[PDB]
Design a protein around this ligand. Structure first.
Ligand code: H2R
Lengths: 267, 835, 169, 195
């Protein structure tokens, strides 16, 4: 009985190889989908600020002129309030429009909540740009507003640097140069030092920032002698374009599954 | 710890006469200053004729299972009642407590004159438990002679309007294990003047004229104080008065004889354990010393104890007198005939008592107090208090001799070192601006000496507070007496954090992805099943058998910690299947334990500094590797039955798809390669790779493993090492050509052993960038292509980046893909077509 | 977030939907003249003169992305979107300038809000071609209505609510 | 007709509770730390101010790794993770550690030998009991609703001083709102900071 079992065993071992399969055959009968890369960028931006104690606010894309322009210290005859740059709701002089930034959300939030306020608003915004490689009439913005006692430009720079590190890596930082916006004073443009890549690190313009203008605080019932605030905004499509090196914005907006699927599921 | 309100009240009332509070308020005050009240027990009410009686006759009824007694009982005014009773711990002449017809006992028991055991019984003789007076023990309650006359009212004699508080004292407050300590705490909480019951106005010192007994102490035993005093000529027949027996009973101690009762009583009153030796049973000098290896002692419960060389003993010339601080020995124990007593008031080393009693499983009333440090300043006060009480109760004489060893050299000052603290430190820690004088006032209340020097307090805690060593200890005293409820709720500003790590996000994404695909997560036990790797048939040298082992598992046969998550998952699978849930897919994400050497401990690093970087690395290197794994098991139907069709049984391909789900969730590419690796089926087992690194295995389990383990047929499994899957943060920039595509199918014949993916790779390498997509449609076998060959049909999608591909440019790319397959895997073209 | 993750794991690809409706879409759909979806907010200065109406429904944008994928040879497609729509309840009504030297009152804020079209959040999806692809397991399975019902169930599980489905025209 | 041919699965309710706890603290600026379940005695007991002969260091309550006196064990809390984090990172530190912990309790309706804990540690200049209460109340509101709050009563743990037990006012339900004991807290003991 030495060898009843040795080749009773190697019988059963060949039964096992006879039922072998090719383990490399495709197995995916439910192909993966994909959340949109702009939505996923927005999600990462939101988490970056949630993790610093901020909250997210939302508002309507069809907005009053009051909150889109007047509460934001735009003069009555500012060119932005025209049809050349802004989509207006018919008929003429209806004081209703597609919002040109997400700032009306921060106005609404300042009216609704108690101070201090640290609010991110991410959402869809609209401009009369033709669709081409670097423009789209429908785009997505992130804007932040922090209003508290004793906030300074230094806190603005700290928040901007934290933000930059989260989206571009531990070597990123920002620099600011003086500029002008109606709703900030002082105002600046933000460049980000994009080290990780680009084909050779360089400064890239990222967006705008400044100290919220006292007229904006007054129009929300906030005393600018007690409270100060900083603000900033960046475009998500523009950030994705220069960070990932995506040469044609049409790909971000046209809905071809081949653009989305390489970004993964986003779960 | 149990104590009655009346006693506690009496001690508080000396310094604050009239003090009296409801049980509910007392409970609340004790909770707020930090003492857990486990139970408040009002001594259960009685109503009607529950009175003292005197047993005047006992007749033994025979013929029943138990011994039964018909007793004539004198109930007052020369009235005698026949009462049936089953207890045996009483004799003619004893005072007892009778509940007579018309009475109601706690729990709603009405007493009636029923007929029992052949006779008529006008009520019952009561146990302490039936009166809700004290612990339910065998037999009825016998009051000591002279406690009351027959007919006296039970409720009043027994003191049934008292309330017993059952507390759970924390180990940092040993001083609270006595009426002395709790009353002092109440005095603090209620801002009362306090008279210490251990002080000299309350315990006037006895004479000190010569040693009470010859004593040697080896001081490295940690004994701090050891005092002795004799009482001679006590009457061995005397019993403790009722007031004393009662307080002992309410604190959970049964009275036995005055010499023992008095030591228990004074322990509860002052917190200093006490012991009574029969002096005539002591032979020669009393020695305090460590036990020797193999030494034995018989404690006064008659049990023989195996001692340890760290156990401190009291011995004489002949035998052991005590396990010091734990339990007295049988050889010097007070007995029924003991007439001359040597009283022992000793202070033992807390840690020594703690180790010894836990080893012997002797958590005595003395040991539990010594463990928590007993106040060494009151040993002679407690000794003197206890000798007077014994002489008074049992009619002896207190000898004026006293031994009082106080260390080598003698120690005459017992308070801890002075503590030094800024006057406003409690205010800062609490976030509360207390009134001026608050911390200094509270620190005096607890008994410390407090001096002011500018803004710095110097605080010398009392000898019964060895826990007060640092400023934080003093902060706690101030804060708990002020009340934690005055501390406001103020959200701090936390910093700008960085959120979840990449690893943390990945483990969330993997769980979400597996759950959406039908898997149910389990929490896997790390204790391996008994003999699991023999069930699996693993080789003796399989690394998975090298397990870390637990010394004290809850199941003796499951001491090994899991090197693999599959055993826990299969155990949950069997459980689901045995309950009738046979179509199941489970997953787990958890660390495993994979030792690299035999268990190696690292010696204590001093905690008065931080460990160095090298010490930290050495601690880490001593631990088993503990990587994160993800694993899953599947059995039964993968797709359920329904109107669409019969459903689809689990197959190995479902385990491969789980690998792909995890890889997509991780944003990495995997390849699968045939492998032979138990417990998988050798023909249906893939090893998983990211790049050239192996990250685990997947496929169908081995039918022999399935059968030996009682698993469902066809069970499949996956296990991946998450630690071996590199992090990845891709930044895609996909090219999306809008020009039209060209669709072609190609069928290639290859040896059966060639993996389909190798053919697809070769086709891809030859076709170049024009190839946008390749998918395997058909695997066909048959005699006309050769017995050991197979035909693979691939769908190909070609697209140019800048132009409309001609159908001839497409065919050029197809030709190159066919040629590459020919050169790499020996493929032969069977045919192609436009799709 | 949970709805998007759940639809993406089940094979749907998210698009960003344009709010400018295609020209004549509701005539293509054959909707009645009084269908509430025809009551659209209109933009005064659209980039395409014949597309001035803002979307009351997300399906037109999704079908437009679907046609684009299909015309490029990607015929087995499942798309979804999560976005607000614009549903006016009256003719365009502007609210006059409120002075900016103070904050608006609660009543002024409510009046500004009441003047805007309702702008609820919608989720929508479209599917065409093969739901299950062809492979060694078999020929695959074409999209059917039951796949749209299952998308409802995916969204309901993601929302932790129970739904019922009822025949409708 | 039924349409679900891929039945939904489920992440474990304890994991999901842990996830919600983690998000609650991430949203206040804290971070999460992890560590091994088989731990040194140094970090499980010694760095946490347990006396050498504390009963917790025995086999009655703790799983030890064989053989005897190996100074290796299944951790009895997640505190060794905060010790490791204090050694590794610069101050200030606001750290949550959620993870599996082990006790020699038999499995029954209200005990398990394998359980999961959340512990938090905040170390900074000028932190007080008031900040503790604020963080505890925020935590309670997130897990039990806007009407929840906590109360503290004095207690004892070797690694805190002062020490307290935390009750949560559980309004939303229970069959009639009441205080429920939730856990323990206190000011980290100076000996822990020294070590
Ligand atoms: O996105 C962009 N342009 C674009 C154009 C086309 C396509 N893609 C992108 N830029 C260019 C313009 C710039 C405007 C800006 C400047 C400064 C701060 C900002 O943020 C605010 C402003 C106000 C407030 C409030 F508090 F007052 F309400 C709060 N935050 C916003 C944002 C980035």
């Amino acid at each position: 009985d030495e060898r009843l079992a040795t080749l009773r065993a190697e019988r059963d071992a060949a039964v096992l190889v006879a039922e072998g399969i090719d383990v490399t055959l495709p197995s995916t009968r439910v192909p993966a989908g994909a959340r949109h890369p702009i939505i996923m960028l927005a999600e990462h931006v939101a988490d970056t600020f949630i993790a610093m104690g901020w909250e997210l606010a939302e508002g309507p894309e069809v907005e009053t002129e009051q909150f889109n322009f007047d509460a934001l210290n735009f003069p009555a005859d500012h060119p932005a309030r025209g049809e050349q740059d802004t989509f207006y709701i018919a008929p003429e002089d209806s004081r209703q429009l597609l919002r040109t930034h997400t700032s009306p959300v921060q106005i609404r939030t300042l009216l609704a909540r108690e101070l201090p306020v640290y609010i991110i608003s991410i959402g869809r915004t609209f401009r009369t740009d033709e669709l081409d490689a670097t423009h789209t009439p429908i785009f997505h913005q992130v804007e932040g507003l922090a209003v508290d006692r004793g906030l300074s430009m230094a806190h603005l720079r700290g928040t901007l640097d934290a933000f930059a590190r989260a989206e571009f890596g531990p070597s990123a930082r920002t620099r600011i140069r003086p500029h002008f916006f109606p709703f900030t004073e002082p105002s600046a443009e933000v460049d980000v030092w994009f080290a990780n890549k680009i084909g050779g690190a360089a400064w890239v313009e990222w967006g705008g920032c400044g100290m919220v203008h006292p007229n904006v605080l007054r129009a929300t019932g906030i005393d600018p002698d007690l409270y100060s605030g900083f603000a900033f905004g960046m475009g998500l499509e523009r950030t994705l374009q220069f960070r990932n090196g995506i040469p044609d914005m049409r790909d971000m907006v046209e809905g071809d599954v081949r653009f989305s699927l390489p970004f993964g599921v986003g779960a | 710890m149990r104590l009655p309100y009346s006693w506690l009240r009496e001690v508080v009332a000396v310094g604050a006469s009239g003090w009296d509070v409801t049980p509910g308020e007392l409970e609340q005050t004790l909770l707020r200053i930090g003492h857990e009240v486990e139970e408040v027990i009002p001594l259960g009410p009685v109503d009607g004729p529950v009175t003292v009686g005197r047993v005047a006759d006992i007749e033994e009824l025979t013929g029943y299972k138990k011994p039964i007694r018909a007793c004539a009982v004198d109930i007052g005014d020369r009235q005698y009642r026949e009462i049936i009773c089953g207890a045996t711990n009483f004799a003619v002449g004893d005072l007892v407590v009778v509940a007579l017809p018309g009475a109601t006992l706690p729990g709603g028991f009405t007493i009636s004159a029923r007929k029992a055991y052949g006779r008529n019984s006008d009520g019952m003789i009561c146990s302490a438990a039936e009166l809700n007076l004290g612990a339910d023990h065998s037999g009825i309650l016998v009051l000591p002679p002279g406690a009351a006359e027959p007919g006296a009212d039970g409720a009043g004699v027994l003191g049934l309007d008292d309330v017993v508080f059952h507390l759970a004292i924390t180990p940092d407050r040993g001083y609270c294990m006595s009426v002395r300590g709790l009353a002092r705490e109440l005095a603090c909480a209620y801002d009362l003047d306090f008279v210490d019951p251990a002080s000299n106005s309350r315990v006037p010192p006895l004479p000190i004229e010569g040693p009470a007994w010859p004593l040697t102490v080896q001081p490295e035993t940690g004994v701090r104080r050891f005092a002795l005093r004799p009482v001679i000529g006590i009457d061995p027949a005397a019993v403790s008065p009722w007031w004393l027996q009662r307080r002992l009973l309410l604190c959970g101690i049964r009275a036995t004889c005055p010499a023992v009762d008095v030591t228990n009583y004074v322990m509860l009153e002052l917190g200093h354990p006490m012991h009574a030796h029969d002096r005539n049973r002591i032979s020669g000098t009393l020695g305090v010393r460590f036990a020797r290896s193999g030494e034995t002692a018989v404690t006064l419960d008659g049990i023989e104890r195996k001692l340890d060389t760290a156990d401190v003993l009291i011995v004489d010339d002949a035998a052991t007198a005590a396990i010091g601080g734990v339990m007295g020995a049988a050889s010097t124990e007070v007995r029924a005939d003991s007439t001359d007593v040597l009283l022992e008031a000793a202070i033992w080393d807390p840690a020594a008592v703690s180790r010894t009693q836990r080893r012997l499983h002797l958590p005595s009333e003395a040991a539990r107090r010594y463990e928590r440090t007993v106040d060494p300043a009151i040993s002679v006060a407690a000794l003197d208090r206890c000798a007077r009480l014994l002489a008074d109760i049992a009619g002896g004489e207190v000898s004026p001799t006293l031994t009082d060893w106080r260390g080598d050299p003698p120690c005459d000052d017992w308070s801890p070192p002075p503590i030094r603290m800024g006057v406003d430190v409690p205010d800062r820690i609490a976030g509360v601006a207390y009134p001026q004088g608050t911390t200094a006032r509270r620190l005096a209340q607890i008994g410390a000496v407090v001096t002011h020097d500018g803004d710095t307090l110097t605080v010398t805690p009392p000898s019964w507070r060895p826990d007060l060593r640092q400023p934080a200890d003093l902060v706690e005293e101030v804060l708990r007496l002020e009340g934690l409820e005055v501390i406001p709720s103020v959200l701090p500003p936390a910093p700008a954090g960085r959120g979840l790590t990449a690893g943390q996000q990945r483990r969330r994404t993997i769980g979400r992805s597996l759950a959406l695909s039908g898997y149910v997560e389990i929490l896997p036990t790390p204790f391996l099943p008994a003999g699991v790797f023999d069930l699996w048939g693993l080789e003796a040298d399989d690394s998975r058998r090298m397990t870390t082992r637990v010394l004290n598992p809850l199941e003796a046969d499951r001491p090994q910690l899991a090197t693999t998550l599959l055993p826990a998952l299969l155990e949950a699978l069997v459980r689901n299947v045995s309950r009738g849930l046979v179509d199941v897919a489970l997953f787990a994400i958890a660390q495993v334990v994979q030792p690299t050497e035999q268990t190696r401990g690292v010696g204590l690093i001093p905690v008065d500094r931080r460990p160095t970087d090298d010490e930290i690395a050495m601690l880490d290197a001593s631990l088993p590797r503990q990587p994160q794994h993800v694993a899953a098991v599947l059995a039964g139907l993968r797709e359920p039955r329904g109107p669409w069709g019969p459903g689809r049984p689990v197959e190995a391909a479902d385990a491969f798809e789980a690998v792909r789900i995890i890889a997509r969730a991780s944003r990495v590419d995997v390849t699968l390669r045939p492998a032979q690796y138990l417990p998988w089926h050798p023909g249906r087992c893939a090893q998983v790779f990211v790049g050239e690194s192996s990250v685990g295995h997947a496929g169908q389990l081995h039918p022999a493993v399935i059968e030996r383990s009682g698993l469902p047929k066809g069970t499949c499994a996956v296990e991946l090492n998450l630690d071996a899957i590199p992090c990845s943060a891709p930044l895609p920039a996909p090219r999306v050509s809008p020009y039209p595509a060209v669709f072609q199918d190609v069928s290639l014949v290859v040896a059966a052993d060639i993996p389909a993916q190798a053919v697809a790779d070769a086709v891809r390498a030859g076709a170049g960038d024009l190839l946008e997509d390749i998918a395997l449609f058909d695997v066909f076998t048959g005699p006309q292509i050769g017995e050991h060959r197979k035909s693979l049909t691939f769908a190909l999608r070609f697209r140019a980046p800048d132009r409309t591909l001609t159908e001839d440019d497409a065919s050029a790319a197809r030709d190159a893909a066919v040629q590459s397959a020919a050169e790499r895997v020996g493929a032969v073209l069977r045919g192609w077509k436009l799709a």
